[PDB]
Design a protein around this ligand. Structure first.
Ligand SMILES: [O][B]1([O])O[C][C]C2=[C][C]=C([N]C(=S)[N][C]C3=[C][C]=[C][C]=[C]3)[C]=C21
Ligand SMILES: [O][B]1([O])O[C][C]C2=[C][C]=C([N]C(=S)[N][C]C3=[C][C]=[C][C]=[C]3)[C]=C21
Ligand SMILES: [Zn+2]
Ligand SMILES: [Zn+2]
Lengths: 257, 257
């Protein structure tokens, strides 16, 4: 139905998902000379319980690490939020080559990949399903991933991918605290935005970290060696899944710093 | 340089390696109706000592498993041979899809991949460096691989690929008997031929197995997820390394069966 090829990719998504041309679409270019430093922004607080880590899935366009979200063992607080948000998933976006692959850009600079750590508002809603399409329903941390030194913090994730090479495969994925993937400093930009693929809900408060994390060209090759086809079919490696930046349409990107 | 691209591939090899146009070039199409039964052909005897297994290396166009060749712990004889031939290497050839990856063809049928188990004449010569260019220097078993069920005999080889992802990377590879990769029956065809890539020496007596072995689509994808680039550079996956069949130029393909 949708993907990242010319026939089915980001420039055609509006045919099934009209919000694709909406006014709070993500990702965006962060122009640093136009960010408002906001004094009321408190530090970001993550407290993740590695026990909430549940499984790793191949979803054909990407792979997902999902978390038990039945209670408040793993939460994000602070920043612009009064509410606690419940960890439910992390995943990555990458590009065909190392020169692009991030979704978010900073001063028009494209990075090699992007981590998304996704949370839902359990103070206001009782489920992800209820939260997912509310303006205040999702909190997502974006981390820009800069091609360089191999990132050993990625290691448990990349070692698990051999178990889920083809679309539909899943394996348990336990005892993992995704805060171990976050940069050293949680200084951040925040703007009201969307999911970066279908269903593209304008439900996301973004926390884009100013600090990047490393990844080697060979760790990126591991992502791209993952297959979009089902077991038995001809291999179609997942070459890219990064959406181009979208118009800010008058939104303000606030800095914590 | 040489490779398998439109730039440096099999159709321009003759520029740097003029023997590419020779009269004993490999691979060839084996036409079952034209093969001659030779009553002098003995059964092929392989006995390989798993302790000769030394190392696995990414050589850019392929990966090689190399064996200690200082004695005759690991030998080929029988078939058309008066001499004993010392195991030194096995490796594979594959194609960009699963339909076309073998080098030899049988009645024009292309298989998905091909195993080469390479030996040098330790009766007439004292090293590989020496034997490599002698008409009677090399003996190579070629097994055709047919896409189908996962081949569990490939498991140790495929498990080792994660340690040699980029060109020049090598790792220990020990305690392996590659006769485990051969089909049950060692009924064969034999013809005089060449190395199937540069330096393309007409030094090879081929033993082409009548029986194929299996390989899965996902095992072939693991071959193709090896990188031809050096560490640090942008990932270039190894998509194919099979040479087109060459003119038979009046050679007789003998059958053991
Ligand atoms: O990169 B992204 O698109 O946008 C950024 C945040 C994000 C978070 C999670 C996910 N993962 C899934 S399964 N998305 C589907 C979904 C999510 C919620 C409700 C219905 C449906 C994707 C994204
Ligand atoms: O498929 B093939 O080309 O041709 C078929 C047999 C074969 C055997 C070994 C190898 N592997 C190497 S390292 N080849 C290089 C070489 C150079 C000089 C002397 C020896 C060997 C390759 C082949
Ligand atoms: Zn995402
Ligand atoms: Zn070969």
């Amino acid at each position: 139905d949708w993907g990242y090829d010319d026939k089915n990719g980001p420039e055609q998504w509006s045919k099934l998902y009209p919000i694709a041309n909406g006014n709070n679409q993500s990702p965006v270019d962060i122009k640093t000379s136009e960010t408002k430093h906001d004094t009321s922004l408190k530090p970001i607080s993550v407290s993740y319980n590695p026990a909430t880590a549940k499984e790793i899935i191949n979803v054909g366009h990407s792979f997902h690490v999902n978390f038990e979200d039945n209670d408040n063992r793993s939460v994000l607080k602070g920043g612009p939020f009064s509410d606690s948000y419940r960890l439910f998933q992390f995943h990555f976006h990458w590009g065909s080559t190392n020169e692009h692959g991030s979704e978010h850009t900073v001063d028009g600079v494209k990075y090699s990949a992007e981590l998304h750590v996704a949370h839902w508002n359990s103070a206001k809603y009782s489920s992800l399903a209820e939260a997912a399409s509310k303006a205040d329903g999702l909190a997502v941390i974006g981390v820009l991933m800069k091609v360089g030194e191999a990132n050993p913090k990625l290691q448990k994730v990349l070692d698990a991918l051999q178990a889920i090479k083809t679309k539909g495969k899943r394996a348990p994925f336990t005892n993992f605290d995704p805060s171990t993937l976050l940069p050293s400093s949680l200084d951040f930009w925040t703007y009201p935005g969307s999911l970066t693929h279908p269903p593209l809900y304008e439900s996301v408060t973004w926390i884009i970290c100013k600090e990047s994390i490393s990844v080697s060209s060979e760790q990126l090759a591991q992502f791209r060696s993952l297959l979009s086809n089902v077991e038995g079919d001809n291999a179609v490696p997942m070459q890219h899944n990064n959406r181009p930046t979208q118009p800010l349409k008058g939104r303000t990107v606030r800095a914590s710093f």
